[PDB]
Amino acid sequence: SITNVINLADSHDRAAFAGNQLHMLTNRHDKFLDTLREVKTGALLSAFVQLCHISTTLAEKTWVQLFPRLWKILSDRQQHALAGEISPFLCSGSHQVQRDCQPSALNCFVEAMSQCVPPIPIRPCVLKYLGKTHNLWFRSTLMLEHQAFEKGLITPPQQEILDSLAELYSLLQEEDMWAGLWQKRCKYSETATAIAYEQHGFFEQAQESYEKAMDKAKKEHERSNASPAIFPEYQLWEDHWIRCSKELNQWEALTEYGQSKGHINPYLVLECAWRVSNWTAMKEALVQVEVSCPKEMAWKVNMYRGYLAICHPEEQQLSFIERLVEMASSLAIREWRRLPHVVSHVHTPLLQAAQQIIELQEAAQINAGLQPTNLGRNNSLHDMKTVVKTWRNRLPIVSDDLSHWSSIFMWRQHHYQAIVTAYENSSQHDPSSNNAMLGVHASASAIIQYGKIARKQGLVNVALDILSRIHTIPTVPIVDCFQKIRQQVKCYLQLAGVMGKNECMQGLEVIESTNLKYFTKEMTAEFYALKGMFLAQINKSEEANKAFSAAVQMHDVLVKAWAMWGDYLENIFVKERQLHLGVSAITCYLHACRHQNESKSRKYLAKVLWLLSFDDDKNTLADAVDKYCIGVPPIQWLAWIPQLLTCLVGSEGKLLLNLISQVGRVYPQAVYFPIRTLYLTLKIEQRERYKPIRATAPMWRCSRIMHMQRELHPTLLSSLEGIVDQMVWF
Amino acid sequence: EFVLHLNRLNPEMLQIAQDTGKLNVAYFRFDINDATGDLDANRPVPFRLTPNISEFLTTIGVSGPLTASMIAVARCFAQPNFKVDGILKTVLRDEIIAWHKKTQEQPENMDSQQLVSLVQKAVTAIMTRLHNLAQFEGGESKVNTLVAAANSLDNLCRMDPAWHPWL
Amino acid sequence: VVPPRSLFDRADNPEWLISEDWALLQAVKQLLELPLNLTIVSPAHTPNWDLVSDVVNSCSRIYRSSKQCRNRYENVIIPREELRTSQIYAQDENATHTQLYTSHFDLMKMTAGKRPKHASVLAESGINYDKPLPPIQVASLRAERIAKEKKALD
Amino acid sequence: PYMVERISKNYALQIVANSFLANPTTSALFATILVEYLLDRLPEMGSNVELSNLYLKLFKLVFGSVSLFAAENEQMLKPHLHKIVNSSMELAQTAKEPYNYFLLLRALFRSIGGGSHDLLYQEFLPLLPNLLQGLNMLQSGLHKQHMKDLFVELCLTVPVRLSSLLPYLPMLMDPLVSALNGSQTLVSQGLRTLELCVDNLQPDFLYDHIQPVRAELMQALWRTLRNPADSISHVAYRVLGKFGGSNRKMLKESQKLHYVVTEVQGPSITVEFSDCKASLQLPMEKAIETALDCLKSANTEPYYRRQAWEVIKCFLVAMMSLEDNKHALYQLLAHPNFTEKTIPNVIISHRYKAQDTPARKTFEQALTGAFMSAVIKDLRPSALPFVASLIRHYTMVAVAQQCGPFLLPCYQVGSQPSTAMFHSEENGSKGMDPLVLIDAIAICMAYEEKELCKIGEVALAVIFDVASIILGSKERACQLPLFSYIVERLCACCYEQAWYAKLGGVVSIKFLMERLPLTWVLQNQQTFLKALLFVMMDLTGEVSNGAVAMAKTTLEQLLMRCATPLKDEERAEEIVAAQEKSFHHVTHDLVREVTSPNSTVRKQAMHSLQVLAQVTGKSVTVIMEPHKEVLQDMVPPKKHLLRHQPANAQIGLMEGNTFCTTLQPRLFTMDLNVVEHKVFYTELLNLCEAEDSALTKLPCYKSLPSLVP
Amino acid sequence: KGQFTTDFDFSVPGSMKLHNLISKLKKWIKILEAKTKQLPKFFLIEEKCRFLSNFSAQTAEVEIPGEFLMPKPTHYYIKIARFMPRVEIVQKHNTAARRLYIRGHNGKIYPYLVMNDACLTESRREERVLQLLRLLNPCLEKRKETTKRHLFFTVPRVVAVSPQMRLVEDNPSSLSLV
């Protein structure tokens, strides 16, 4: 109030306290305040309700704030009755029309209930259904986690809580949380071992562990029946053995397993049969899935219908592909809107589905180009080449499971083979077979890329099996053969990383069997560099040095040859310590850096800087660095600049001044603040030491660098110095 | 903190970004023993996995994503192609030069033999911890034991009270 | 609890396991709180066969659609409850579902069980393999080649 | 020239112009004559609304002629193209209404976008670097929504083939992100541009250029999947599929989360449920936010505007005490201390305010909604009286707290600004502070829609009148600490980034300098000067919708009012001393600007010193004489060679030297025997005589578009 | 100062004990924390920093600090267009720090902390560990298991502009566990 100052004052001043314009002002204000005293709660309530009608966000917020408060003012008997009635309310079918609302009214209702104190108990299976159905995913997950922690993580209630939580974790693609829960839950040690293996990409070991668990379970079934408490573990074994077989590229066995009599799995066959060109089984599985399919899988059913429409030997129907692609996209978008608004691992399947669906459309375009009317026409050839190049550049990423890589590459393989068949059977146009050779090259490149991705993910045996399919092709261009041999060599190097001599011998055998005469000079240089690597691991130092020398003489720009020769010489230098080996290693490393790809060269310049620690009193290694560093772009040295300044303060800074000066010339702001800081630190230390003083040699070098930068970049350095001068007021 | 023998993570050092959940440390330093120039970091706990953090992560969060992420990082940095040992050598060389300037001392450079030996000893200690954590034979990892040691109240109660082994 | 009156109140390809039928019946009874004949007790509580399908599929041997669950319930469980499904489930003692998993384990085990001339090209290059050049000499040769290329370009 | 005046009076005469443009014989000739006339009148497009719309339509007629008769009309348009583009971009920075210059650019682009016009594509390519840079800077700024939509559209619809865009592609990424976050047409345009880039460019090159935007771009694409339009969402899904694995690559900049920093509950209304025999609190923060959003939007139905106004009014009534009694109120306000005791010399500053409490934020929003209701025509008859009386209430609360018999301890004599003046979580005031009214007035003054400025002036007038009545005089009224808060809070609008916030600050300064007494204006003259000069500096090179011009006029008026010599009857000691002190401080600030690198601020300082000399009757030298110490390092430049300084600083120093030396009695007389003077003179000679190539090799000149300035 | 010198006189009995010193430190920390809360929470650059207030893209092409800590794959360096007129005063790292806002030529606002360090060597060592973390990050980008878990070190840009002063890249939404 205006007069509230009186109430705040002490008793003495109040006791002491006890014109026309001012009187008129206070009268008019009293009449105003009397008009306000009339204002009633009902008016605000009505206008509030109207604003809740206009605004859905306001309505949702108000209900979430209001229902717990109403619940608190209920009695205990009323609360128990209302909870017992709320449980079937959430389950009701009428809510299903809300499913695609954003928000669903049932979503807001469940969010309001979760805030209630005392809590309203909800069955775990209901919570899971609501989480997956009404976009309540993480709310349901957190509620189930709280229920599990309250119950001490077994009794059937604890069983159903952990079941619903595990299913929600699996549906959210939260692999680690699911793994932790099941490691605590599982009854068989083999299950925990298998989960640990699969969690980190050891799919072969995980598959063996799942098989061992199944063998133990069968051995125990001959003694007694199995309780329903262990059935989720057996379901886990079956599902993740299937997943491991998918990651291990075992699609034929999975198609056979899915067609087993009495235990048919049409969904597995529908996922697997098309990859091995079993289109009859694909049609049968499509019919069974179409009668009875989960709603989330609808887009995949449309996409597989497109697969059959394109690739089935007899039922080719290219006119359906546009509508099938549109339907798949619409269904995928609908599924996307049912996912959480923050994008996480749960969204990855649909983000992969996007590329899959557009590649289905592009495949339809390619097959339209191969029809007898269009075959050989210039526009068809141009479109085919364009789509092949677009596929070549458009790849998945390394975090993607090998099953998704398999999907993309095997679909493309079917269309590459279609191109090859079309332009080999006709052979009227293209008498030089360039179109068939384009198909063959694309297929070989796709096979090599699949094998390379398998090797990068640690599935070296899978990669070796994949790469062996190049020999199936009758003729392949020499580039693809070179890449295949290179990937095989890398596979054997990776295997020797844990096995040792034998895999190095196998890689050397592969290199020796290679018929160089077809290969170019760069290919020969890469082969000899690989041979040098293998011989270095075999501890055949002399032959490895021969191989590296010959490799670099073959193609003196091959960065990898220089880097591997430098690694070999640095390993010999660290032990034997003759300085000439240090100089050779620095020369090799610096010649590997003579390019702008700074991310590759970073690990080599680190070796160069580390090697300067072995320098003698004559600065031989620093002399080599000064000689060879010409041709290394200064962008290479940006990450190293702290280390370069540390060397600058040392005795080797006399020979490294030109390098740092060049870096400062090209990147003045990068050098200026570190050199300035170093110079002032040196001055402070000098003042402490002689507590004017002649500047030391490192100070002179810093001053030279700063003077050169002031000469080349005077407005920039005056702006930087102006900024730093201002910082004192801070 | 454990593999690179960094100083202890005080709760004042641990910066939590409310808008994203990203964590940064202000500021880690190498735990060089000033008297001998080698790394120690032999503390009762290998890292901060203190009871308030443990409760917030939950036991599922500790077992699953925390452990799996530590194992994955250890296995990644142990890949020979990355050559992490060389980067460690070139960073610890500056660290050892700084320690020599602080403790032992154109000013003369420190002895090449001493510098090389100290850097090699420190990088060997780092790579030993790295390769211990990276080993994953039998589906079992040392990282589980490391996490159990960090959470263990026996190890927590032996820490500095200023570390806040209750927070 | 009596609901308040409203203005609108009028004043299969795979065989079904006993565990699936039991889950179906228990879902309808416990979750929907509906009687045997699905007569509506409260108007807000309409049958939700999607929820029932979700419950059944948590332990089913194959995906059962909501339509399939409704058909099974109305055409088998209603006549059976009008041996009861509970009696059959108790008498089965999980044997059939155990044998299902034994069969799957046997099929998975079956599937698991079912599983020189090099000197010529160097001599054409001019490389004496048996007398390695040190990196200094190869770097000098590279520099000479680059200088000669620059002179030829100029 | 006559025909355009007649068309302006009678728009039906466009038909004759249309007929000339449509006939093959006369099309090229008439288009040439009309474009030459319109180009001569291009600056007027930003000044007179009627002529601006007329000239825009006539330019559209020309561009449609170039569409009709491509062969000769392209040749006609080709030489003019550079003038059109460059002058439109240059004149929009200073135009009061720049919107028509960008509608002219859009029309030109939609014309050349006919594609066949290769002669115009070739002529347009040299414009492309500077144009795209300017448009990128514009779209990055703070503007009204239609202006930003136009800037984004112009960025995405530059009439050049994608192969020519290649070096300038990084300029297009931020407009692309903006378009994906814009309206439906903008989202479609951005998706079209992105699909073009994906289809035509290599994935590695495109990914490298996306990488700066990529965190925001991928989040925009993901959100676009949820768009209700099937075409938009389908195009987004297709683009994501074309990105392949790049769509899901880890974002280093993770997705932002909505975090609640405050533990305290917001303000709430009490609802009683008699059946339950209990009361609940109904929370109002979201309700007030929704009501303010409804009153801000133009699309809202009048029914819901009335409902929002009712919510805001009821909340405002509920959050005030209402316990004031008429006789007690008059007894308090009629106390002699309100008219006799010296008003405490206490400063209130938002520098000592902590972050707003939820209560304070909700108060500020509710008061802003009240002012907006006062300006909305359908709500004005009830809202405007309510707003005036509520302003009186808050002013009375503030006056009673700040002085009289019972002033609060934080206002008492010798008290510094502190947090106790504001409602805060930790120390705070007892109850809501009445200063939250000033925050609402500042929000209204800084609001995008400038009509709200009028109600802010009405509110300030009501505050001033009530304070004058209670305290007995205007001089006593302006001594309130509340007015120091008003000065600091309204001048802060000038520092705010948006041009409309700046303009609101300028308007507040003009109103205050017009209304309040001369002594108070002299006390605050330096604060106003700094605010106006900052307005002039910060909008340099930006589109200011008359903000800089208004700032210049306001500054000249302020200087004239303060400097104007007092009459013999008005020459009291206090007013004379205040005027002398203020004049000293203002001339000190102006003389320091004389060498400013900022051309606008430098020229305004020179003009201001001349204005002061004309008003006082003194000479510029006499005014500048006590200050000239501040020039001693600059006239001539001592501490740096001009070669080291940037070109703008060099020009500022040279112009300031010209100004000081050209004064009638020279403020500084150069002596070539002095080393620094000879150096400066030699540098000037070398700069005048040296060749353009010899200057270009010098690093400071190396980037100038032209050495000529 | 006088009463502070009176409390911290080490000649009085019982003052050399460590825990009595700790209690006295706690008392005076509380006193100064009470006094620090009364200080202004922001200042304007015009008040002292005429060069920063005047600075524009016409002054120089200065990159925002830290752009060269790791070479960006392309030349898309963020240049400095403005220093926002308000500098805020914030309690971070158990010190009073000034938060400077730099507007970039892209229009985004970058917060930076201006920090004063009494110890040179410790700051250099901290920057060394930050550099190591930056160097290790690319390895995590290249493997499955780490890319699929979204693993990356968060390394804010720290640039030392003087032995006592460095510019740090602030997250205004950041709190410490203490």
Ligand SMILES: O=P(O)(O)O[C@H]1[C@@H](OP(=O)(O)O)[C@@H](OP(=O)(O)O)[C@@H](OP(=O)(O)O)[C@@H](OP(=O)(O)O)[C@@H]1OP(=O)(O)O
């Ligand atoms: O998987 P790795 O054998 O370790 O080598 C790969 C990759 O090899 P592939 O393409 O054969 O899989 C490249 O090695 P090179 O082809 O250059 O021999 C190279 O990527 P670039 O194509 O960009 O050169 C990159 O190495 P780097 O990190 O030095 O770029 C990378 O090796 P990483 O796994 O260590 O990344």
